[PDB]
Design an enzyme around this catalytic site. Structure first.
Site, PDB file in Angstrom:
ATOM      1  N   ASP A   1       0.400   4.936 -11.525  1.00  9.57           N
ATOM      2  CA  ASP A   1       1.070   3.590 -11.168  1.00  9.57           C
ATOM      3  C   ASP A   1       1.111   3.784  -9.715  1.00  9.57           C
ATOM      4  O   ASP A   1       1.096   4.903  -9.325  1.00  9.57           O
ATOM      5  CB  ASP A   1       2.403   3.642 -11.757  1.00  9.57           C
TER       6      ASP A   1
ATOM      7  N   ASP B   1       4.734   0.320 -17.510  1.00 15.89           N
ATOM      8  CA  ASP B   1       3.742   1.476 -17.659  1.00 15.89           C
ATOM      9  C   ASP B   1       4.022   2.524 -19.097  1.00 15.89           C
ATOM     10  O   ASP B   1       3.256   2.908 -19.305  1.00 15.89           O
ATOM     11  CB  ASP B   1       4.250   2.561 -16.405  1.00 15.89           C
TER      12      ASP B   1
ATOM     13  N   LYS C   1      11.462 -19.918  11.736  1.00 12.11           N
ATOM     14  CA  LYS C   1      10.571 -18.756  11.553  1.00 12.11           C
ATOM     15  C   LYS C   1      10.900 -17.403  12.255  1.00 12.11           C
ATOM     16  O   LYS C   1      10.187 -16.632  12.518  1.00 12.11           O
ATOM     17  CB  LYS C   1       9.015 -19.007  11.632  1.00 12.11           C
TER      18      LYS C   1
ATOM     19  N   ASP D   1       6.285   4.780 -13.375  1.00 14.14           N
ATOM     20  CA  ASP D   1       7.920   4.735 -13.209  1.00 14.14           C
ATOM     21  C   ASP D   1       8.515   3.561 -13.891  1.00 14.14           C
ATOM     22  O   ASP D   1       9.417   3.470 -14.665  1.00 14.14           O
ATOM     23  CB  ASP D   1       8.366   4.823 -11.668  1.00 14.14           C
TER      24      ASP D   1
HETATM   25 MG   LIG Z   1       5.499   0.692 -10.784  1.00  8.48          MG
END
Ligand SMILES: [Mg+2]
Ligand SMILES: C[C@@H]1O[C@@H](O[C@H]2C[C@@H](O)[C@]3(CO)[C@H]4[C@H](O)C[C@]5(C)[C@@H](C6=CC(=O)OC6)CC[C@]5(O)[C@@H]4CC[C@]3(O)C2)[C@H](O)[C@H](O)[C@H]1O
Lengths: 264, 31, 992
Positions: free
Chosen positions: C345, C690, C456, C686
């Site tokens: 990841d 996943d 902006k 994490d």
């Molecule tokens: Mg992740």
């Protein structure tokens, strides 16, 4: 499944197990080289001699029927074998026998444990010494024996160690041999050398086999007469002497225990 | 009576050296 | 089943604010009725993930008897639990032999279990007392009234109001939102906030800005939307079910184990029956030749091996808990070094998931900040005046503040009240310039224009602290273009200067360079107002133009991104040096993805994508030979229509790959596709997106702190401090414990050959029983228990990180080569040493070898109380037995003396014992204990009965010596040959 390399394995082991077998034998041959012909290097294992019995008792027992001839052919066979040795025909010529004292004589060390002289002389023993042992059916004859021991010099108890009641007192040269089982349901008789109920100290020390082939050890006929015939009886022969000991685990150390039953 | 061993003293003599490595090895583990 | 979950989802964000209301029959300003509320509640269910099927029980102990190995122990101890009964029906002789042996193996199974059950018990509690997730309350609008309730009470149709700080109660369809950002680091795994607007953006319910997904959390701003998905019906919800509802699979280490048995049993029945036919041909009734076949099992099946291996693994894993690497499974400890391809990841895993000031452009010079958690890098510059004028602006033109009560935790770990970018600034100045509150106090803010969507930019007007020129100061920050569009000068080295079109270019160089590095850029400028048009008490109009907004003094740029971990990069490099393929699987956008990739070394220097080439030679896409592109990058949108053969092919022809913007389910297919090659792949994520990848992985590995619950669950490993570098330490230990396992199987199995043969030839040459049963059990678990375990602690006979990952299909743990050494070579010499001592004890006690053939009959006869030796002496039953048993005892000692030798030649594989010396301190102590034990089991007052162990005479011990030393040599020599000729018929034949 590999090919062409098989010969590589075969040739390897062949001359590996081949040499391994070489070394294992090699050593074997050397440790064969430090032990006598005449005497075992260790004997502390047989310290107490063991009293063995001729009637080959399946489990220390002789049950059989007086009314059957074949109900004790088994006990007859083996008692035969032990005795075919003591033939007066086997031992005829003083070579290599010697008509020792017809009675309890004295021991005589025949030199040492060498092959420096001939075949150590071997005292005789007459099947006749064992009266009334047919064999009889009424009251089977059971002979006892002492276990062979190189250099063993049995020394019968002094006149100061004796209880009720191993008699007579053959302090001279003879190993007493009483039998018992309380429970006195028997009548004991002993057919001995001299007639005594013991071993003659004229047959020791036994000089190996390699030094005294054809050697023969004493015998001690002991058969009962008036006994029960409808119950198993527990009787125990026992030897006696300073050089004689017994253990709790070995029920054969200088003694037997026989469960006879003459059922019929 | 050359039919005798001093087993009682090798038992007393081995049990004294198997109890020494037992403690030598305790000297090298617990270091 | 799950196949439905392997596919993209659908949605209806493409429905007008009305439709969405007509379909749910709810109100947009009122929200449905509390009556319509409780109702639609009992219809479906509560809003939460169904109770995770994680309720084990004592029965679990059984799982410890599934292991092929555990089976033998059971099949054997049961099969040897029957031998007693078979004979018993006849005569009760061997009742301590068979009967005991069974109970022994029996209890063995039982304890071995405990070390396996106490593992997955201590690990749980040790991970159950962590940060417990406590669901909060949501804010809904029912009957026009806004209220807070149990998140479970949220139904599909009610109005939900989210703010900056809380999280998304359920799946939402925004209908109102003011400057609303959120965190999609659970779906896309992308930390940088994602604006949320009631207006649909992309046709993909995963890109739309009008849908908030559960399990996420609104970063800043406010908003309101209707609930369309509840509980498992939520986007991320479905993933959870597929994650914890997936299949486990067989581990690598377990493969070796199960395969090892096939070989063991493989010979144990070959000998078992080979000797049953042999026994028959040797005059043996049908009641014997089989009672022997059953025999050759114990001898052939390691009783202590199981408890050995287990102790080993347990141990190695304890050496990892010491380096902050935890595990839930015992088999896992090995997988990490059998790995050939790591899937990772990006966010939370390779990175830290925290916006951080990366670079700055001041003094027409690119500077770079330190980006690690513990600031392991170095400072850039603090001397130049420009820096101070820049540091002031970032510190004052800023509304972020450190949450109260955090003077304990390091700056980079303390929570901040504010959006992404501004938190970064706050932290960055707070670090290398002291407290920022010190700056907002000395320089009091009077009027400011908060960052406008149109403007902006964000500006401020502060009271100068200088007692000399304490005149109104103007500070603003915003897009690099908007800032430069309002600039006349540029503070360089302290003094101002014209905005030349030279520097109006060297700023256009930096702004496109830092931007190309996938970093967010901010421009900074200030102005010292004219104190004539502004008195001491001038009032400023934040709504009207009361001051100057044009022609300001440009000070500099600063950029920021999602920096990687501390040693993440250095780490990845390691694995590549080892030959492990690194593959990034993130659901992020290619731009940033490919970026972090080259920054961590997943993609090395000089390598290019098919696209990179296309850009360089300025050619089309479909004109560059794909083979010239060693690297590549794949958007999840391209994978959607890709057949497995293609992914297959993509993984084959590329070395550095980065699958980007991938859906959770793609992670899965990626992993799968890598496994389809035959590789051992590890997943380290994490974000909950996943799990489906990490649970399907030979071994998964999670991020302790930042990792979500469900990834932790489906995971096989837990990094407690997130220290990647443990991974390397992990594969190293994994590879080390592998070999040393071999060495121990070796040692152990070698002990076997001199345990069997004594019972084999016993039947072939009819000689008294050289080795008794009670004896064997005093080796396989007496003296051969310490040494083995000690082998766990051998080091590496070389640098192992320097070698490729083992080919799981080829380099087995117990291969045929190791068999033909312990069995066909060393054990053999160990056997002969055994018999040598045998014939010695008998010979010296009056029974020559020659005379020993065919004795057993009469020997074991319990009636003949006058068996004759070769000296003519006559032995009772018990007397000769005392020799047999005293001939058992030294065979037992003698073995030990050859296990001295074996234990040393096995400490190594190729290195000579002189080369590897004697560093192992345990292996040493084992000899002393293994010995001290034998010695004790001999001269023990009573053992002569409790174990039929009798004392040994002086001349006894030295019976094996000449053999034991032979072994030592044969192996030292053999290994020297392996070294000299690394072919070879010496190594590829004997080399374990
Ligand atoms: Mg992740
Ligand atoms: C020739 C044979 O000799 C005697 O018996 C022998 C066979 C059999 O009876 C047994 C007991 O059952 C065997 C048993 O079978 C196999 C064993 C389990 C074997 C092991 C293999 C292994 O891997 O570890 C242990 C080694 C010894 C063992 O423990 C016993 C030892 C006592 C013995 O008694 C010995 C009797 O006199 C018998 O009647 C006669 O047939």
């Amino acid at each position: 499944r590999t090919g062409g390399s098989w010969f590589k394995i075969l040739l390897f082991y062949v001359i590996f197990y081949g040499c391994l077998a070489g070394i294992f034998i090699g050593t074997i041959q050397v440790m064969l080289l430090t032990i006598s012909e005449f005497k075992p290097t260790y004997q502390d294992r047989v310290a107490p001699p063991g009293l063995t019995q001729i009637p080959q008792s399946q489990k220390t027992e002789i049950s059989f029927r007086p009314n059957d001839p074949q109900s004790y052919e088994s006990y007859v066979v083996s008692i035969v074998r032990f005795l075919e040795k003591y033939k007066d025909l086997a031992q005829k010529d003083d070579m290599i026998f010697e008509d020792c004292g017809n009675v309890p004589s004295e021991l005589k060390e025949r030199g040492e444990y060498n092959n420096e002289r001939g075949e150590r002389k071997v005292c005789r023993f007459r099947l006749e010494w064992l009266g009334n042992c047919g064999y009889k059916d009424g009251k089977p004859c059971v002979i006892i024996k002492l276990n062979r021991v190189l250099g063993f010099k049995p020394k019968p108890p002094k006149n100061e160690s004796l209880e009720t009641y191993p008699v007579m007192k053959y302090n001279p040269y003879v190993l007493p041999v009483h039998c018992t089982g309380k429970e006195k349901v028997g009548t004991m008789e002993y057919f001995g050398l001299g007639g005594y109920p013991g071993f003659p100290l004229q047959y020791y020390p036994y000089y190996g086999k390699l030094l005294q082939p054809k050697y023969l050890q004493p015998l001690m006929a002991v058969q009962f007469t008036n006994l029960t015939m409808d119950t198993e009886i527990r009787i125990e022969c026992k030897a006696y002497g300073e050089n004689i000991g017994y253990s709790e685990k070995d029920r054969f150390q200088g003694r037997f225990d026989v469960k006879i039953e003459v059922k019929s | 009576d050359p039919f005798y061993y001093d087993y009682e003293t090798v038992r007393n003599g081995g049990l004294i050296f198997a109890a020494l490595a037992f403690i030598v090895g305790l000297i090298i583990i617990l270091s | 089943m799950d196949e439905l979950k392997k596919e993209v989802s659908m949605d209806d964000h493409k429905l007008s604010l009305d439709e969405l209301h007509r379909k749910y029959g709810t109100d947009l300003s009122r929200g449905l009725t509390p009556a319509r509320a409780a109702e639609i509640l009992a219809r479906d269910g509560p809003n939460a993930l169904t109770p995770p099927p994680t309720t084990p029980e004592w029965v679990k102990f059984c799982r410890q008897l599934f292991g092929g190995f555990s089976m033998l122990l059971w099949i054997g101890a049961i099969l040897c639990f029957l031998a007693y009964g078979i004979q018993a029906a006849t005569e009760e002789e061997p009742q301590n032999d068979n009967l005991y042996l069974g109970v022994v193996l029996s209890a063995v199974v039982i304890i071995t279990g405990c070390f396996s059950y106490y593992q997955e018990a201590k690990s749980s509690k040790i991970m159950e007392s962590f940060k417990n997730m406590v669901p909060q309350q949501a804010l809904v609008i029912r009957n026009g009234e806004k209220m807070s309730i149990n998140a479970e009470e949220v139904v599909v149709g009610d109005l939900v109001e989210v703010k900056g700080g809380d999280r998304i109660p359920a799946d939402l369809r925004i209908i109102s939102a003011n400057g609303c950002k959120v965190d999609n680091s659970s779906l896309t795994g992308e930390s940088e906030p994602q604006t949320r607007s009631p207006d649909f953006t992309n046709e993909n319910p995963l890109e739309t800005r009008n849908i908030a997904f559960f399990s996420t959390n609104c970063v800043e701003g406010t908003a309101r939307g209707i609930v369309v998905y509840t509980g498992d019906r939520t986007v991320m919800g479905r993933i959870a079910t597929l994650a914890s509802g997936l299949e486990g699979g067989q581990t690598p280490i377990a493969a070796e184990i199960e395969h090892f048995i096939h070989i063991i049993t493989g010979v144990a029945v070959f000998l078992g029956v080979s000797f049953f036919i042999l026994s028959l041909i040797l005059e043996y009734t049908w009641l014997e030749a089989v009672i022997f076949l059953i025999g050759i099992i114990v001898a052939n099946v390691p009783e202590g091996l199981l408890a050995t291996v287990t102790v080993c693994l347990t141990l190695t894993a304890k050496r990892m808990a010491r380096k902050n690497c935890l595990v839930k499974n015992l088999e896992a400890v090995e997988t990490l070094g059998s790995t050939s391809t790591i899937c990772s990841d990006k966010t939370g895993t390779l990175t830290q998931n925290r916006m951080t000031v990366a670079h700055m452009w001041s003094d027409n010079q690119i500077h770079e900040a330190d980006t690690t958690e513990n600031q392991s890098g170095v400072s850039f510059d603090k001397t130049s005046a420009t820096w101070l004028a820049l540091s002031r602006i970032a510190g004052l033109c800023n509304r972020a503040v450190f949450q109260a009560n955090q003077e304990n935790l390091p700056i980079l770990k303390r929570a901040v009240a504010g959006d992404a970018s501004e938190s970064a600034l706050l932290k960055c100045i707070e670090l290398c310039c002291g407290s920022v509150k010190e700056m907002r106090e000395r320089y009091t803010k009077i009027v400011e224009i908060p960052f406008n969507s149109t403007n902006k930019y964000q500006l401020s007007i502060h009271k100068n602290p200088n007692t000399a020129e304490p005149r109104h100061l103007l500070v603003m920050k915003g897009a690099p273009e908007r800032i430069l569009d309002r600039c006349s000068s540029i503070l360089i080295h302290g003094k101002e200067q014209p905005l030349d079109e030279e520097l109006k270019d060297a700023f256009q160089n930096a702004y496109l360079e830092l931007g190309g590095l996938g970093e967010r850029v901010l421009g900074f400028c200030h102005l010292f107002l004219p104190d004539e048009q502004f008195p001491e008490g001038f009032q400023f109009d934040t709504d009207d133009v009361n001051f100057p907004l044009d022609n300001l003094c440009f000070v500099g740029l600063i950029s920021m991104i999602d920096p990687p971990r501390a040693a993440v990069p250095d780490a990845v490099g390691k694995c590549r040096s080892a030959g492990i393929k690194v593959i990034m699987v993130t659901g992020d956008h290619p731009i940033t993805a490919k970026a972090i990739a080259k920054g961590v070394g997943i993609i090395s220097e000089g390598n290019e994508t098919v696209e990179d080439i296309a850009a360089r030679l300025n050619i089309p896409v479909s004109q560059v030979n794909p083979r010239d592109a060693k690297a590549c990058v794949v958007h999840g949108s391209d994978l959607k229509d890709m057949t497995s053969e293609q992914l297959d092919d993509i993984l084959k022809y590329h070395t550095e790959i980065v699958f980007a913007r991938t859906s959770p389910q793609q992670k899965l297919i990626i992993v799968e596709g890598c496994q389809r090659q035959g590789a051992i792949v590890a997943v380290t994520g994490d974000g909950v997106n996943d799990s489906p990848a990490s649970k399907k992985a030979d071994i998964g590995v999670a991020m302790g702190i930042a990792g979500s619950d469900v990834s932790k669950q489906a995971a096989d490993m837990i990094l407690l401090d997130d220290n990647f570098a443990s991974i390397v330490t992990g594969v190293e230990e994994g590879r080390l414990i592998f070999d040393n396992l071999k060495k121990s199987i070796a040692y152990t199995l070698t002990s076997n050959i001199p345990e069997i043969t004594p019972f084999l030839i016993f039947i072939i040459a009819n000689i008294p029983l050289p080795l008794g049963t009670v004896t064997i059990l005093c080796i396989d678990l007496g003296t051969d228990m310490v040494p083995a375990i000690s082998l766990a602690y051998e080091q590496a006979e070389s640098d192992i990180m320097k070698r490729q990952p083992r080919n799981p299909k080829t380099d087995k743990l117990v291969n045929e080569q190791l068999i033909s050494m312990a069995y066909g070579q060393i054990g053999m010499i160990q056997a002969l040493g055994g018999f040598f001592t045998y014939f010695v004890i008998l010979a010296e006690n009056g029974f020559l070898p020659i005379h020993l053939l065919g004795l057993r009959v009469n020997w074991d006869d319990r009636w003949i109380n006058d068996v004759e030796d070769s000296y003519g002496q006559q032995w009772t039953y018990e007397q000769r037995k005392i020799v047999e048993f005293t001939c058992h005892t030294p065979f037992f000692v003698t073995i030990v003396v050859v296990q001295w030798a074996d234990l040393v030649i096995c400490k190594t594989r190729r290195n000579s014992v002189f080369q590897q010396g004697m560093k192992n301190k345990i292996l040493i102590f084992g000899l002393f204990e293994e010995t001290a034990l034998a010695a004790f089991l001999s001269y023990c007052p009573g053992m002569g009965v409790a174990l039929r162990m009798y004392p040994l005479k002086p001349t006894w011990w030295f019976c094996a010596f000449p053999y034991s030393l032979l072994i030592f040599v044969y192996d030292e020599v053999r290994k020297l040959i392996i070294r000299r000729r690394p072919g070879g018929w010496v190594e590829k034949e004997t080399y374990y």
